[PDB]
Amino acid sequence: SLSNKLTLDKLNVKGKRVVMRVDFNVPMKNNQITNNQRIKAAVPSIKFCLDDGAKSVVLMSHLGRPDGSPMPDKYSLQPVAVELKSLLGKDVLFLKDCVGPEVEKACADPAAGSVILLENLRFHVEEEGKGKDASGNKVKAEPAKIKTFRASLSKLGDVYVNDAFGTAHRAHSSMVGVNLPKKAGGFLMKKELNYFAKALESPERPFLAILGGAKVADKIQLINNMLDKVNEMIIGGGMAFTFLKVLNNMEIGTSLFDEEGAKIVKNLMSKAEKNGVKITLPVDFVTADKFDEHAKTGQATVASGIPAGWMGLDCGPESSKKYSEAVARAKQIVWNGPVGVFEWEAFAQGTKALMDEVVKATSRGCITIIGGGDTATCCAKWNTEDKVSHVSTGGGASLELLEGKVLPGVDALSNV
Ligand SMILES: Nc1ncnc2c1ncn2[C@@H]1O[C@H](COP(=O)(O)OP(=O)(O)CP(=O)(O)O)[C@@H](O)[C@H]1O
Ligand SMILES: [Mg+2]
Secondary structure, three states: OOOOEOEHHHOOOOOOEEEEEOOOOOOEOOOOEOOOHHHHOOHHHHHHHHHOOOOEEEEEOOOOOOOOOOOOOOOOOHHHHHHHHHHHOOOOEEOOOOOOHHHHHHOOOOOOOEEEEOOOHHHOHHHHOEEEOOOOOEEEOOHHHHHHHHHHHHHOOOEEEEOOHHHOOOOOHHHHOOOOOOEEEOHHHHHHHHHHHHOOOOOOOOEEEEEOOOOOHHHHHHHHHHOOOOOEEEEOOHHHHHHHHHHHOOOOOOOOOOHHHHOOHHHHHHHHHHHOOEEEOOOEEEEEOOOOOOOOEEEEEOOOOOOOOOEEEEEOHHHHHHHHHHHHHOOEEEEEOOOOOOOOHHHOHHHHHHHHHHHHHHOOOOEEEEOOOHHHHHHHOOOOOOOOOEEOOOHHHHHHHHOOOOOHHHHOOOEO
16 A cells, blocks of 8 residues: 555665654553553564664654543553563663653754654644543644644654554544655554555455454444455354344344344345355354353354343354355455454354464465454464464554555655
């Protein structure tokens, strides 16, 4: 997607200060980084700069959603400075702010090979452009203030590099507001985009897409677009029940149901048929008397229906077989969302078996792409991240792409 945009590999950073937007918005538990995949995924771009004789490297990102309110005790990027220092083996200068005189002078003529990490960009309402004040009232940013903020960020360097794929879908100040003669996309951006371009412009055939999750309404455009590129599609998780109900008139008990999505199901099937797309739905399920990790377990099939008062939380053995059948024929796979409540061991077996199949397919030459989010965390708790072709570092961003949208984060990049 950047074949028409400027990239790091085509930039000259010798003796220059580099302002690099990155995505260090990692998850925490109480004071520790539960997952540092996002930090490690940006190192390749940081080193390339340093190894190429860079005067300095200024990194900026956000953490959570403070709403433009300084919350150092809740969303401080300080702990990320400690984590980075160890992964880089180099010293990192952390600043209590990301804009202002003090920061601006600190980033002017610094000691060569200097790594500087700025503070949460969202501690200012100028980043997103909106937020709230102490009074609790929702406020809007001033065009004059926005220009100032964007102007301060631009003074931090000579060239600008964007490697925040996970934030590529946001049209915030640090993503599209930096005013510098050169805006280059990082390696992480080049890598992530290269995989999704393969599964969006010219995939290997057969091409299979596995879509799970809970709701259907917020997935309509994702399915609609994918129905123009895939050969086979698996509809699993709570999503399936909305299709079985409208398509087979099957009873679903107290299982998840999407009223809004139920009205489009028939239009989705019609599009698949016209395009020659095979849609695999589950044939049996693992039920529960209630929504609880320690609920009573049962079983059911499409033909028998789900008993009243019960609900399907995972697929069954026969469904696992069909899924594997589709996985075996594929030459490329895109997976987004679990096919069952994987957070509870008793209902994660269906997702576990599919992962095993997906892992075996990769070792046979199949291109396997797992979209970030709930389906990304799985592989982590399974240590099967290096058992597939690619695990995305951006769920909401990769979703935007799959829907066929344009990420403001890359469009704002310099042309070539
Ligand atoms: N058969 C099923 N019944 C109920 N929940 C299911 C399910 N199959 C999957 N899920 C749940 O679906 C969730 C993923 O759904 P989805 O991708 O829509 O979530 P989301 O993060 O966009 C917001 P929400 O989960 O609130 O809808 C997982 O947390 C998983 O436990
Ligand atoms: Mg959702």
